[PDB]
Amino acid sequence: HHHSRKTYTLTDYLKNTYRLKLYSLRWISDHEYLYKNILVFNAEYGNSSVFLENSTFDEFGHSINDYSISPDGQFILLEYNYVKQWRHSYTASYDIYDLNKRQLITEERIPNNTQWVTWSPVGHKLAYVWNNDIYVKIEPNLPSYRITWTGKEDIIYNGITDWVYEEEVFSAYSALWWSPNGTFLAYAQFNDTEVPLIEYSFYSDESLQYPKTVRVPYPKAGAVNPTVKFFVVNTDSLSSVTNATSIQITAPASMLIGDHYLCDVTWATQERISLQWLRRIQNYSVMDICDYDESSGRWNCLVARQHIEMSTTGWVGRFRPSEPHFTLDGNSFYKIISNEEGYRHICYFQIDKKDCTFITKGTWEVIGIEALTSDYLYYISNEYKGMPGGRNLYKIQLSDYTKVTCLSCELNPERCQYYSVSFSKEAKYYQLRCSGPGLPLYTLHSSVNDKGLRVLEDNSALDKMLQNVQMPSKKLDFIILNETKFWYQMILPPHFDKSKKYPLLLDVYAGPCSQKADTVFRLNWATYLASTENIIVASFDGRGSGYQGDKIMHAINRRLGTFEVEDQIEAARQFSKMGFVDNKRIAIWGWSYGGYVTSMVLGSGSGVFKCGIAVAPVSRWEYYDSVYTERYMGLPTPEDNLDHYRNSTVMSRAENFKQVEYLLIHGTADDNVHFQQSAQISKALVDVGVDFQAMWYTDEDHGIASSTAHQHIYTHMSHFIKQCFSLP
Amino acid sequence: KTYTLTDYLKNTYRLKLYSLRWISDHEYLYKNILVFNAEYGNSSVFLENSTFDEFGHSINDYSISPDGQFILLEYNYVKQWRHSYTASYDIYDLNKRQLITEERIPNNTQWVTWSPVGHKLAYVWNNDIYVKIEPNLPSYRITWTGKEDIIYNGITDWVYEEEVFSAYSALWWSPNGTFLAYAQFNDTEVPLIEYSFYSDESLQYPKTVRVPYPKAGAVNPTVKFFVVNTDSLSSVTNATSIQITAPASMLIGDHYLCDVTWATQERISLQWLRRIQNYSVMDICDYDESSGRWNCLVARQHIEMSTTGWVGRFRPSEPHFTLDGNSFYKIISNEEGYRHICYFQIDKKDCTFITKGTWEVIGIEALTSDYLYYISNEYKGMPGGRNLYKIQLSDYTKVTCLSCELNPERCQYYSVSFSKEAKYYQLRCSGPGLPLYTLHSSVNDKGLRVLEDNSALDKMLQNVQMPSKKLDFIILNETKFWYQMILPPHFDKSKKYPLLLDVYAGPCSQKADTVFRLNWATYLASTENIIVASFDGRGSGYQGDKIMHAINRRLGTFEVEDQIEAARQFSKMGFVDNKRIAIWGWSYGGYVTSMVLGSGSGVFKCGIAVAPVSRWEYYDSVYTERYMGLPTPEDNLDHYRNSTVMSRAENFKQVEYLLIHGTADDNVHFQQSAQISKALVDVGVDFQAMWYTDEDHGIASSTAHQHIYTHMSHFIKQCFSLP
Numbered sequence A: 001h002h003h004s005r006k007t008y009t010l011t012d013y014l015k016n017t018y019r020l021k022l023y024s025l026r027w028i029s030d031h032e033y034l035y036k037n038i039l040v041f042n043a044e045y046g047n048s049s050v051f052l053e054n055s056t057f058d059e060f061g062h063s064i065n066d067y068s069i070s071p072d073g074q075f076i077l078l079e080y081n082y083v084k085q086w087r088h089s090y091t092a093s094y095d096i097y098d099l100n101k102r103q104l105i106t107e108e109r110i111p112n113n114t115q116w117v118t119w120s121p122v123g124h125k126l127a128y129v130w131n132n133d134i135y136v137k138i139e140p141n142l143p144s145y146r147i148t149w150t151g152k153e154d155i156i157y158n159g160i161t162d163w164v165y166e167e168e169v170f171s172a173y174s175a176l177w178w179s180p181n182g183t184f185l186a187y188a189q190f191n192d193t194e195v196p197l198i199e200y201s202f203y204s205d206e207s208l209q210y211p212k213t214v215r216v217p218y219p220k221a222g223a224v225n226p227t228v229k230f231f232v233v234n235t236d237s238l239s240s241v242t243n244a245t246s247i248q249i250t251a252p253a254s255m256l257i258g259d260h261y262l263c264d265v266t267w268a269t270q271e272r273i274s275l276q277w278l279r280r281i282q283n284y285s286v287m288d289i290c291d292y293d294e295s296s297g298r299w300n301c302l303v304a305r306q307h308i309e310m311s312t313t314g315w316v317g318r319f320r321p322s323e324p325h326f327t328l329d330g331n332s333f334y335k336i337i338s339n340e341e342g343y344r345h346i347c348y349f350q351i352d353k354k355d356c357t358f359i360t361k362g363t364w365e366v367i368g369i370e371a372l373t374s375d376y377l378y379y380i381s382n383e384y385k386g387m388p389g390g391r392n393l394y395k396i397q398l399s400d401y402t403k404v405t406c407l408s409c410e411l412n413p414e415r416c417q418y419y420s421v422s423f424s425k426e427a428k429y430y431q432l433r434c435s436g437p438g439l440p441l442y443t444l445h446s447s448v449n450d451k452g453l454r455v456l457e458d459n460s461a462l463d464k465m466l467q468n469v470q471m472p473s474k475k476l477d478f479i480i481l482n483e484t485k486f487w488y489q490m491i492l493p494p495h496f497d498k499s500k501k502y503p504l505l506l507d508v509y510a511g512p513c514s515q516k517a518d519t520v521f522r523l524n525w526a527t528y529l530a531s532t533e534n535i536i537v538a539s540f541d542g543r544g545s546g547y548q549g550d551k552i553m554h555a556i557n558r559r560l561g562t563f564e565v566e567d568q569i570e571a572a573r574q575f576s577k578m579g580f581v582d583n584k585r586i587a588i589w590g591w592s593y594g595g596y597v598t599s600m601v602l603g604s605g606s607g608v609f610k611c612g613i614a615v616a617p618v619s620r621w622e623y624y625d626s627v628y629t630e631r632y633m634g635l636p637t638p639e640d641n642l643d644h645y646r647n648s649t650v651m652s653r654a655e656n657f658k659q660v661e662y663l664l665i666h667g668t669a670d671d672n673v674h675f676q677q678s679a680q681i682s683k684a685l686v687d688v689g690v691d692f693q694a695m696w697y698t699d700e701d702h703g704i705a706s707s708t709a710h711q712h713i714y715t716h717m718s719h720f721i722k723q724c725f726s727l728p
Numbered sequence B: 001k002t003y004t005l006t007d008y009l010k011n012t013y014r015l016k017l018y019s020l021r022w023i024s025d026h027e028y029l030y031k032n033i034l035v036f037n038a039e040y041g042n043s044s045v046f047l048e049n050s051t052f053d054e055f056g057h058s059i060n061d062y063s064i065s066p067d068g069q070f071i072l073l074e075y076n077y078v079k080q081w082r083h084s085y086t087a088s089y090d091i092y093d094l095n096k097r098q099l100i101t102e103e104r105i106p107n108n109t110q111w112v113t114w115s116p117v118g119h120k121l122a123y124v125w126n127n128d129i130y131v132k133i134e135p136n137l138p139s140y141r142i143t144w145t146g147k148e149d150i151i152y153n154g155i156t157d158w159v160y161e162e163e164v165f166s167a168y169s170a171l172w173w174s175p176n177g178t179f180l181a182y183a184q185f186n187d188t189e190v191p192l193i194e195y196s197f198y199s200d201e202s203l204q205y206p207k208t209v210r211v212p213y214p215k216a217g218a219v220n221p222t223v224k225f226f227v228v229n230t231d232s233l234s235s236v237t238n239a240t241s242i243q244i245t246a247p248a249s250m251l252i253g254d255h256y257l258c259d260v261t262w263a264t265q266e267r268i269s270l271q272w273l274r275r276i277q278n279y280s281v282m283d284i285c286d287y288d289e290s291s292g293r294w295n296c297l298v299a300r301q302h303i304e305m306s307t308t309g310w311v312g313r314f315r316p317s318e319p320h321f322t323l324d325g326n327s328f329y330k331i332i333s334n335e336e337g338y339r340h341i342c343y344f345q346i347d348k349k350d351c352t353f354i355t356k357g358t359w360e361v362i363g364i365e366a367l368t369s370d371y372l373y374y375i376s377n378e379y380k381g382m383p384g385g386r387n388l389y390k391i392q393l394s395d396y397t398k399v400t401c402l403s404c405e406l407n408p409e410r411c412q413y414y415s416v417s418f419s420k421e422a423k424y425y426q427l428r429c430s431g432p433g434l435p436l437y438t439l440h441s442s443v444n445d446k447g448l449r450v451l452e453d454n455s456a457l458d459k460m461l462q463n464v465q466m467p468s469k470k471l472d473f474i475i476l477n478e479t480k481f482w483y484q485m486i487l488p489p490h491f492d493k494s495k496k497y498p499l500l501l502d503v504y505a506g507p508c509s510q511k512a513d514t515v516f517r518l519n520w521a522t523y524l525a526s527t528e529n530i531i532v533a534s535f536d537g538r539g540s541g542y543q544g545d546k547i548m549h550a551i552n553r554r555l556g557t558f559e560v561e562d563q564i565e566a567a568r569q570f571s572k573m574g575f576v577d578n579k580r581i582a583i584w585g586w587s588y589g590g591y592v593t594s595m596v597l598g599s600g601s602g603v604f605k606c607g608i609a610v611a612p613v614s615r616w617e618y619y620d621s622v623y624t625e626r627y628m629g630l631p632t633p634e635d636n637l638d639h640y641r642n643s644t645v646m647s648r649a650e651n652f653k654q655v656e657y658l659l660i661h662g663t664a665d666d667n668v669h670f671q672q673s674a675q676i677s678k679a680l681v682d683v684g685v686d687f688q689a690m691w692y693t694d695e696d697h698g699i700a701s702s703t704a705h706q707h708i709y710t711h712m713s714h715f716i717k718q719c720f721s722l723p
């Protein structure tokens, strides 16, 4: 034989039999990067001297979670006693090790339970947050300077975000920003005094006799939001005689008039910082540009340099207003905005000018600006072949916008259609990561001649292992609806036969700016279901999905739980009318927003779906957080949008669940989508006499990511789908 | 046609009761509200069905005063725990036929009670006691110390309500209403259980419910006892409450007040229990005239202890005093370990037993000048039967069974309700046939008339294939252990049936009896042809202390092993499919079901645990410590650690498990199933779950009740391969 008889099993997925190798590096200069044990690989010639041996901290006495080398390379920060908080936040102990002296600093140690630590961009200055206050060390072995004195647990946050800013605004815990040379330290201060608390039980180890009540300031749609203030402190004029003096930069008048957010901080030069503010009604944002005044020691934002971004069709930006990329003199910047036709492109702005000029055009979008030099701007887009699920690196000549070159398109067009990039400190070198459709590929390049210097990781060991496995394939394509293309992907079982009828699982996100149809290679639950169980797993980007323009993306504005829900149902009708789908066995499942859509679909009375699984779903928008929800829904008030808030709950559709088989799953310590939401679904299903299947995960959060819990839920979901589809 | 799930869920086939409230020695009330005579059976209407048409509120319950002059109307009923609730109250003048509108009982009243004679009234509001001499006059504030969740005057806290008094009230009027005795509970340092309450879909942020609840080994509430004279209440000076302190033998450590019983007008008896519940003391306290105080002579103390276990069935039994209050009868276990009636003299340590045998007195029912009446399981040596007996006080040898022979075939489980001076009594037969309610004259013990025969139901059941009950015993180690089986209709001995073991198995439980039930087991047997069995093993009650105390300090051992062995015996009976045996239980039954499934015996295919205890340190102090002692290194910590469901997680790989729990369960906290599920996830065991949002220990909402039973039926049918 020698024919492939093996499949990709559930155990393979759960035990990581088939492992994807990565190549993670960190640029130390414009020609040097670190890699792990710790080598400073010289990018240029390939010669790599060793930086730090793996044996150096064996006598440490603690397990080291992470490390951080100072920009000057004189010190290393050692992160241990890591305790996870939310998606980005955590607490840890830190020790500092002098690299030139070969020993641990024992004097003036960074305290236990530190919330965040950061080196300056140059030298070895240190900023850290402890007990909600900011501290600064000029030298690692010296006493730290206390910058703030107002830090209060759950009320006042200095240099760190609160729950909502962490999850929905900055996608980070830190709210500290060093100036390019480390002279100034800018920070946000959040105030949660009147923000209501979400409360839930945490059960802990079985030795805890009485459960704990976790309490977190968490604004639900329409509730009192946190307020924010912004400050800048000169670290070079710190004295141990007097308290440090932080200079406030106030929000523009058009923002102070109501509730607003700080949605972006970007340093332009040593003495110029740009701020973006956003109204609570997220259709209007203002960029301030503020210069430092030397005679005063203060900061001033000229109303002439003030820039406005707004939308008449929806909210501003994909999830927030995009960040500027300033020129060296800080007199201009490049920024992604939506053009006249609704497509996101790079606009070039003069600092003193209202009007910008677009440097890219077309019926495609710029994903992000990655680097800019004197001569070139580097950006990722989905232009190539008009595939919105594809990603490539481009280079545009600043003096001639007609001179655009694709740097990644043709490198290896068959295995590589989804690229990300990592540039050196001044874009002289870059690493490219290809994520699919073939096996991930990591390569190094010099930008001068754009030539490939070397293959970093080609995943040949995994290619060897797969050679014998009956792996699934992927079909990426579109369907025309109301004269508009809508993309879908299908994970197709091996030896796929168009004449046969397969059961179908619709895998759904479908939230605003979602994309579930792409060229990325994945080893996941869907791989197992196709490979081993012979199930087609499909996904569909309908109205509301991103990277295709505002016409598609803004279609669900103020109307969550409508078109995106309706387009998933229609997708299933399209797939079955392709001819290879058994439409007695069509299922749907999703996590989070996908959980919400799955539930709305199962409660729609369409009659298309036999069964479905919702994991940690939203059940009604008033339960979810203000920043995300109000972005798309506005306020749940009679004068705003209360009617639709009330018309788009899962609960009100409970009666219709008599037609389907339903599995409802939620972790009890979910701080993001509160257990409350599934608790209300179940209570509504019980109230109408609908039988369903449920599963709670004790102390699990939104990711249900514990090793044991992760394995349990996928095993449980697998049983459910196999029985729904009558698979032995 | 068969008895279906819907039949059970929608109570298609209803059992009639006959509920009466005695008013005198020959007059009682029955529901219109009629005043039936125990002589002639005639009745003149007391309150017409539509007397309160123009009331404006929905009346939940009524209560006539002992003199019959005023009726108390209860509305705005809001349930709290098992017995506790809050309500609004109005008083109706029956003479004037109008509602009282001056000095009304406040909204959110916790407890109200008439005095035993006349029309005096005591109530509890915001944890304080108030007294109304006349319904229309202002009330006197008795206590000023009441405080939400902290100080309880005249009402119980969580643990006393659930585990000690089986009641919310802690008020005790003297026989003629002169004195009002009460208890004060102090929960200051008792730790709080906290859990989420999700409420209506309209609630944006869940509520955190916080209840003082002592888990095993935690700080317990403290108790004080007071008596106040209601005849000398003044609206000028504050009321003076006389404290009666617990005896010196109780004050030495943590203790409980476990019984309050008035002997006469000026004599009260109180029983106290140590936190280590194998030692209790009864105090007899007399009102002193020249001092206005209460004295409890140390010589009048009566100790009740146990060397093999705890004291009483769940608590020390209540005394029944002779009219002069110089003697009393109470149930205690004899030297052989069987519970019998002992006769005590107030001034003497030694009692004499008036009953003997290898069977038990269940309760003393009435005491007269010439006869003591009691209920027991003596008839035919059947621990699961119940009959009423009369003992001649002048000759203990002269014992008459009043109920044994009235209808031996349909009636084997009686309860009774005697008139005020015991001249008449209602008999309540609960099985094995349809319930029967009859009235009797105790002067000659002749039957007056049938009150309710359930013929309406009998004619209904004629057309349905109904299951039968086998009640019998097996021998284990030369000891009889009783079991019952609900057998499918047209039961065939040659066929192999699936079997479901229905479990309680807690200390002093009894699941094998002569009671007729229409329940879930009825549908399973009638429609699904499943045998539903129950077994009373070691630890079970009403069979003496040798069996009941078998599990002392050793919860989760013998009672668990005996359910497994019982199923092994049912397998050897020949009509059981050994490939289709399942087990289920609620509460303690959930604990035992889980313990059995985690035993790795290989006997059971599948099971269901509803609101199970998972480990004893999570459950309340009074119940748990009674059997387990304290979870400390110097006491019983090792067995607490050994008797968890969690430690058996790995053995659940052999079985199919359904775990169900209500999220607002104040009794067995959701915590308990949360720890089970986590342990099963940690060893990679697949199982089924169901939470019930906002449901408590009963899971008793109309919709949730229907939902849980439907869900369980599908699970059992799937386990048994039933289409």
Ligand SMILES: Cn1c(=O)c2c(nc(N3CCC[C@@H](N)C3)n2Cc2ccccc2C#N)n(C)c1=O
Binding pocket: A167, A168, A319, A508, A509, A511, A590, A591, A592, A593, A594, A595, A618, A672, A673
């Ligand atoms: C199915 N699904 C999502 O719904 C999803 C998601 N990443 C996000 N985020 C978008 C903004 C930034 C950060 N909040 C993460 N969402 C949005 C969401 C909507 C409703 C409830 C919960 C969540 C969440 N986490 N992913 C990866 C995903 O698969």
Ligand SMILES: Cn1c(=O)c2c(nc(N3CCC[C@@H](N)C3)n2Cc2ccccc2C#N)n(C)c1=O
Binding pocket: B162, B163, B314, B503, B504, B506, B585, B586, B587, B588, B589, B590, B613, B667, B668
């Ligand atoms: C299966 N089963 C029981 O386990 C049970 C019960 N009645 C009681 N009580 C006995 C003491 C007084 C009062 N607490 C009610 N228990 C005891 C118990 C043990 C463990 C956990 C919860 C509970 C409860 N409630 N019943 C009727 C029953 O069926």
Ligand SMILES: *[C@@H]1O[C@H](CO)[C@@H](O[C@@H]2O[C@H](CO)[C@@H](O)[C@H](O)[C@H]2NC(C)=O)[C@H](O)[C@H]1NC(C)=O
Binding pocket: A150, A156, A191, A192, A193, A194
């Ligand atoms: C955080 O915000 C709260 C209000 O949201 C501030 O509290 C107010 O402060 C002033 C000045 O002390 C008081 O007079 C007001 O009564 C407070 N208002 C309310 C509604 O509480 C608080 O000052 C803020 N804290 C910081 C350090 O910014």
Ligand SMILES: *[C@@H]1O[C@H](CO)[C@@H](O[C@@H]2O[C@H](CO)[C@@H](O)[C@H](O)[C@H]2NC(C)=O)[C@H](O)[C@H]1NC(C)=O
Binding pocket: B145, B151, B186, B187, B188, B189
């Ligand atoms: C209920 O018990 C509490 C706790 O033991 C008593 O509170 C103590 O009272 C004394 C005297 O006032 C104080 O010195 C202590 O500091 C108190 N302790 C605590 C923890 O509060 C309280 O007095 C009792 N209440 C009643 C009505 O008896």
Ligand SMILES: *[C@@H]1O[C@H](CO)[C@@H](O[C@@H]2O[C@H](CO)[C@@H](O)[C@H](O)[C@H]2NC(C)=O)[C@H](O)[C@H]1NC(C)=O
Binding pocket: B144, B236, B237, B238
């Ligand atoms: C009866 O006792 C109560 C409680 O001790 C008295 O009420 C308190 O009286 C004191 C002064 O003696 C005040 O300082 C408190 O504020 C009162 N508490 C309240 C609001 O009840 C009551 O006055 C006593 N009656 C009399 C006059 O003997």
Ligand SMILES: *[C@@H]1O[C@H](CO)[C@@H](O)[C@H](O)[C@H]1NC(C)=O
Binding pocket: A047, A048, A049
């Ligand atoms: C790497 O190569 C250079 C130039 O060929 C050589 O001189 C040197 O030894 C290496 N670099 C260092 C300093 O590690």
Ligand SMILES: *[C@@H]1O[C@H](CO)[C@@H](O)[C@H](O)[C@H]1NC(C)=O
Binding pocket: A093, A109, A110, A111, A112
């Ligand atoms: C952190 O805690 C440990 C003891 O738990 C102690 O040895 C150490 O000194 C602490 N570190 C600092 C800097 O506070």
Ligand SMILES: *[C@@H]1O[C@H](CO)[C@@H](O)[C@H](O)[C@H]1NC(C)=O
Binding pocket: A149, A241, A242, A243
């Ligand atoms: C700095 O500020 C804090 C609080 O405002 C004050 O208590 C402290 O003494 C100040 N330090 C000095 C010495 O200026």
Ligand SMILES: *[C@@H]1O[C@H](CO)[C@@H](O)[C@H](O)[C@H]1NC(C)=O
Binding pocket: A181, A182, A183, A270, A271
């Ligand atoms: C960093 O920038 C500040 C502000 O422009 C300047 O005064 C300072 O000299 C700079 N530091 C260095 C070392 O260049």
Ligand SMILES: *[C@@H]1O[C@H](CO)[C@@H](O)[C@H](O)[C@H]1NC(C)=O
Binding pocket: B035, B036, B037, B040, B042, B043, B044
């Ligand atoms: C029963 O009827 C008699 C008359 O025969 C009457 O005197 C008596 O009051 C009635 N009993 C009641 C309480 O209805």
Ligand SMILES: *[C@@H]1O[C@H](CO)[C@@H](O)[C@H](O)[C@H]1NC(C)=O
Binding pocket: B088, B104, B105, B106, B107
């Ligand atoms: C009880 O509450 C209702 C509604 O708030 C009120 O109208 C009524 O007067 C109250 N009754 C008493 C006796 O206070």
Ligand SMILES: *[C@@H]1O[C@H](CO)[C@@H](O)[C@H](O)[C@H]1NC(C)=O
Binding pocket: B176, B177, B178, B265, B266
């Ligand atoms: C009730 O008993 C008390 C105390 O013995 C006595 O003073 C009173 O007379 C009795 N009540 C009546 C009038 O029967």
Ligand SMILES: *[C@@H]1O[C@H](CO)[C@@H](O)[C@H](O)[C@H]1NC(C)=O
Binding pocket: B276, B278, B279, B305, B306, B307, B308, B629
């Ligand atoms: C009560 O129980 C404890 C613990 O089992 C025991 O040491 C003690 O002897 C018992 N007391 C009696 C009265 O038997």
